[PDB]
């Protein structure tokens, strides 16, 4: 059960990481714009 909890947190971490890289791309685009 604790492993399932940590895997759920891992999913959240992965989605947040993807969203943060996407926002990094957006910030670079706005900066060069």
């Amino acid at each position: 059960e604790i492993e399932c909890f940590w895997s759920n947190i891992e999913q959240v971490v992965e989605i947040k990481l993807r969203v943060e890289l996407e926002e990094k791309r957006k910030k670079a685009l706005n900066l060069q714009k």
């Binding site: 059960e1 604790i2 492993e3 909890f5 940590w6 947190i9």
Partner: protein, 324 residues
């Protein structure tokens, strides 16, 4: 009705809610000299102090979780449930090993746990959340031994290092450890000052004091290396790749680095040995309570606890039956 999580650790008690990150109260613990309840009256009194003063809530409302030492005897658990349910009338209970909570806090069910407290430092291999009792290695080279090396050296310095005065003494030898101790061979050093302003050039002593737990008795590296020797044959690679440390008494500078060196040179070079660096004081002190909090939060803890119904139906036997 937020679940309450308490750690009754030997040297400082950590308490808080299951859903909250940190133990909202952390105060010094004593009735736990050897590792389990020595004095039931004193233990009950300190628990009462906890619920009433520390958290300002009755035990009859919140569900309660307690954590006990890995090597504690069974009668301790049975009497613990008897006392808790009879006196405080909680709705549901559970008991968990501190090493298991440390491995859960790290999100690594299969692990080896190094921890130390008052008078004891232990190595526990946990596989899929079960403490291997036969594999535990317990050594007296605890934080108390190092702090007493500190105290003896201070008395040799002749500094003036009722019970509250002794508590202050223990705290300063502990406070000195965090700032100074690191694991002429040490070069110039710190000027750490006492509250009254006294100090000295704390030189090689900072190196020689921490050396006790490796070489004053079984040192920590030997404690762990034999611990895995006593465990199963083929799960041993898993433990090395999952070695974890916990407890405030483990907070020394480069302590984890020296452990990693010792195990790497002691383990076969081919092995995947690695140490999880939860090295911050906050991390180590909250690790066990963190595991308890996570354990209580989940939606399955509602089925894992010992409900008051269970203790009404049966006596102390439920602890061995419901708590690993």
């Amino acid at each position: 009705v937020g679940a309450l999580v308490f750690d009754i650790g030997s040297y400082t008690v950590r308490a808080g809610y299951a859903g909250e990150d940190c133990p909202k109260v952390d105060f010094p613990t004593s009735p736990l000299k050897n590792g389990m309840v020595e004095d039931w009256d004193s233990f009950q009194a300190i628990l009462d102090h906890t619920y009433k003063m520390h958290v300002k809530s009755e035990a009859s409302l919140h569900p309660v979780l307690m954590s006990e030492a890995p090597w504690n005897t069974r009668a301790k658990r049975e009497k613990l449930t008897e006392l808790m349910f009879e006196h405080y009338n909680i709705p549901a209970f559970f008991l968990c090993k501190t090493a298991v909570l440390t491995a859960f806090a790290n999100g690594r069910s299969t692990g080896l746990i190094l921890d130390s407290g008052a008078t004891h430092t232990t190595a526990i291999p946990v596989h899929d959340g079960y403490v291997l009792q036969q594999g535990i290695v317990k050594s007296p080279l605890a934080g108390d031994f190092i702090t007493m090396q500190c105290r003896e050296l201070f008395q040799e310095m002749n500094i003036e290092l009722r019970s509250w005065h002794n508590y202050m003494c223990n705290c300063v030898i502990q406070d000195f450890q965090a700032s100074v101790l690191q694991v002429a061979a040490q070069m110039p050093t710190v000027h750490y000052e006492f509250p009254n302003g006294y100090n000295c050039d704390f030189g090689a002593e900072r190196l020689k004091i921490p050396e006790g737990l490796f070489d004053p008795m079984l040192g920590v590296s030997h404690v762990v290396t034999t611990s895995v020797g006593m465990c199963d044959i083929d799960i041993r690679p898993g433990l090395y790749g999952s070695v974890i440390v916990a407890g405030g008494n483990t907070l020394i500078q480069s302590f984890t680095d020296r452990l990693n060196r010792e195990l790497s040179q002691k383990t076969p070079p081919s092995m995947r040995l690695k140490l999880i660096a939860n090295n911050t004081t906050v991390e180590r002190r909250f690790s066990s309570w963190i595991g308890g909090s996570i354990l209580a939060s989940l939606g399955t803890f509602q089925q894992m606890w010992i409900s008051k119904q269970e203790y009404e139906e049966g006596g102390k036997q439920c602890v061995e039956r419901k708590c690993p």
